Amino acid sequence: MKVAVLPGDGIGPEVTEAALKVLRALDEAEGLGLAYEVFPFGGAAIDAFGEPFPEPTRKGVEEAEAVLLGSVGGPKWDGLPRKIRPETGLLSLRKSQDLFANLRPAKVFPGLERLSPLKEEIARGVDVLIVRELTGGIYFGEPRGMSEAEAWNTERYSKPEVERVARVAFEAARKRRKHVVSVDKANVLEVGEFWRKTVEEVGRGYPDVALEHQYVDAMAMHLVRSPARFDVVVTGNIFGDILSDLASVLPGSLGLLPSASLGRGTPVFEPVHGSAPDIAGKGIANPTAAILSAAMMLEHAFGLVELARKVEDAVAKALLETPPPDLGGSAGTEAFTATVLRHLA
Amino acid sequence: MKVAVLPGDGIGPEVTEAALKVLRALDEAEGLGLAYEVFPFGGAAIDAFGEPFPEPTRKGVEEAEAVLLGSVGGPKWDGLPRKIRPETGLLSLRKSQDLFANLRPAKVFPGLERLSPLKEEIARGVDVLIVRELTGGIYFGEPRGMSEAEAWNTERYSKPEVERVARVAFEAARKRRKHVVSVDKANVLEVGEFWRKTVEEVGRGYPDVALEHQYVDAMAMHLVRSPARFDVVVTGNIFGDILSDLASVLPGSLGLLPSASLGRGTPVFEPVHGSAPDIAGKGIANPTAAILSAAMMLEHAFGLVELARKVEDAVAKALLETPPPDLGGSAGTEAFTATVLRHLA
């Protein structure tokens, strides 16, 4: 199990090490053959190397089986040339490994329905994975322009772009509850219609996985009214962006959320939360998102789904047993990682 | 006050007459100079005339100051040629009057936070009006197509299309709480950027109204986390469609929602709910949406905002005092219209 570990900035070192504590603990207990090396990325790399993604890290990410990424970014680097800012190294990293699917799961863990914006009864059992196409669609479409008189942008998708994101949806669903919802605007848009028939054609290779389709405006409505009804959700890039952010607020605790970017090259697992420089070194940073990113790595980079589940369960019990300051408790980083390991043992 | 009344199908006759009872009651009490004539539309018109929008109604809508529209649609007409279906007469009606802005308000009335999907504390005080651009954007953009290899669609807007929907937002905000949020994707899209600077230029003529801008994916997140923060929301057509449906589920009682379509010609005020043929003639249909459409008519077609508010208040008190079957009570159509009139007197 070859991991490139890119802690980054701020709380990045702290939360990344908490996830490595879970992983080393599983490696001793099951013999996963863990091997990892820590590499400079982000602001630390700009300061030490002069660019956020230097060639040592490029090579190390190139040679690894997965990246456990921390958090990148800081005011010190915010004014730099776009070429070398922290935010841009994240895009260089995605590009180098041709990652075309962002996976953002939102889950209301047992006993934390209290944190949801939705009423308990709706929040109970939500566990949905949003698969967002990353490389195409309107942010990248041509033709595009603006004049004094008008502006234009093109939502364009080819059969390969849809097909590849559809297979990561289908494959992900097999590792969870065997249901996929593809979301489109097939009733008004050619893109919609084309997307739908390409996912339905791809669906055929996955007989063991159910597929239905929803129009995006009905899908936003269901994500507030009955989000517990969904397992995996797949859609294009801008709708994936709108629907991953919609689903992200449903647990009501944004710092808990893990992320993964999957593609042709080395996959990247990271927390959705930023580098939170303001509390770096205090040992209060909530590691839940970084430990859950480690769990997504086991599931999606090594196929160790059952291990991923076990880690999630330990996290779930820990959030109840010694809630972090974010959930109104007092358990600092170490203390919280400890009760996860304590449930893991 | 010249009104063309188009009751339509199913519960259309029943709920439309309940709204006319409120209006005749205000007309006697204040001397509004109410004048209305009832015209065939929808399925009733297909059956009597052979088309859902016949020339008598076209002319009557042409000569009126506002349309109070009921609900249109029925299985009997669902198989007909697209040219003459009920759904298509609604589009012919919009076209004839060049209505370019759909206004959908979602409001959690006092004491009905219980019905919301969101926790009480978030649902309390939500009252947001979504203004959706109706004529342009991607559903209508050229170029558009599909081949075996790819599909394409164009999100295109000209300075006039944005400018006109922006002024109905600004004007609507003046009649409520003096704040507008315009929503875009200005950070990635040319359309976004262009939309933003055209609304900010239009904002200048409305010094008495505040303007801020939000990216759509952040705006979906806020509509679940703090929707009470917003007065009027304006955006393009597909985002207006996604965000009007998102906000519509927040009261948790879809049958209550009024709608208005505003433009160059005669404005149309209607309930969001369909014709509900199954309960037509039973006198159980909830009139709240049709009475609230009458109130939106007073506000947006005649500028009688204070009267509109008074009607809304009577509705609010009535929903608490004699809740309809939909809110778990027993008050049928008549009974509920009566306690509105009783608060209105």
Tell me which residue of B72, B139, B219, B236 sits closest to A215, measured CA to CA: B139
CB contact under 8 A, A190 and B148: no
Nearest CA-CA distance, residue B216 and chain A, Å = 7
Nearest 10 degrees: CA dihedral of B77, B83, B89, B90?
100
Q: Residue A26 burial by CB count (10 A; 0-12/13-18/19+): exposed, middle or buried?
A: buried
3-class secondary structure per residue, B6-24:
EEECCCHHHHHHHHHHHHH
Give the Cα-Cα-Cα angle A260, A10, A285 (nearest 5 degrees).
Answer: 75
Residue A276: left if φ>0, alpha if ψ -120 to 50, beta else—which one? left
Alpha-carbon separation of residue A240 from A102, A129, A165, A213 (angstroms): 9, 11, 11, 14
Instruction: Indicate if B241 belongs to the active site.
Output: yes
Interface test with A, best of B150, B184, B187 (most A CBs within 10 A): B150
Q: Which of B245, B310, B313, B326 is catalytic?
A: B245
Tokens describing residue B65:
């100051």
Mutate which: A133, A224, A253, vs B, most B CBs within 10 A: A224
- CA distances in angstroms from A213 to A160, A161, A177, A183, A186, listed in the order given: 19, 18, 17, 6, 9
Record: contact B159-A148, CB cut-off 8 A: yes
Contact A139 B189 (CB under 8 A): yes
B217 phi/psi in degrees, rounded to 5:
-70, -35
- List the structure tokens of A63: 């040679």
| H or E element, residue B210 | strand B210-215
The crossing angle, in degrees rounded to 10, of helices B333-344 and B12-30 is: 20
In a mutational test of the B interface, the residue from A142, A223, A242 whose CB has the highest number of chain B CBs within 10 Å is A242
The tokens describing A91, both together, are 């895009």
Q: Which residues pair with B212 in a beta bridge?
A: B181
Interface list for B 247-286 with A (CB within 8 A): 248-250, 252
The answer, for B228 touching chain A at a CB cutoff of 8 Å, is no
What's the length of chain A? 345
| A185 touches B238 (CB < 8 A) | yes
Say if A51 is an interface residue toward chain B (CB within 8 Å): no
* CA nearest to B158, candidates A142, A152, A140, A144: A152
B207 touches chain A (CB under 8 A): no
Contact B85, B51 (CB under 8 A): no
Q: Is A284 known to sit in a ligand binding site? A: yes
| Burial zone of B188 (CB within 10 Å; 0-12 exposed, 13-18 middle, 19+ buried) | middle
User: Considering only alpha carbons, which residue of chain A is nearest residue B249?
Assistant: A221
To the question of whether residue A153 is assigned a binding role by annotation, the answer is no
Q: Which two tokens stand for residue B135?
A: 């004529």
Separation CA B9–CA B283 (nearest Å): 14
Find residue B235's DSSP bridge partners.
B132
The binding site of B for Mg(2+) consists of 217, 241, 245
| Cβ contact B238–A185 (<8 Å) | yes
Separation between Cα atoms, residue B129 and residue B110, nearest integer Å: 17
Cβ–Cβ < 8 Å for A187, A215: yes
B295-320 burial, b for 16+ CB within 10 Å, e for fewer? Answer: bbbbbbbbebeebbebbbbbbbbbbe
State the resolution, in angstroms. Answer: 2.1
Please tell me the distance from the alpha carbon of residue B315 to that of residue B319, in angstroms, as a whole number. 6
Domains in chain A: boundaries: 1-345
The owner of tokens 């059992």 is A125
CB pairs under 8 A between A and B: 138
Shortest distance between the Cα of A148 and any Cα of chain B, in A, equals: 8
CATH number for the domain formed by residue range(s) A1-345? 3.40.718.10
Q: Tokens 């999606």 appear where?
A: A300
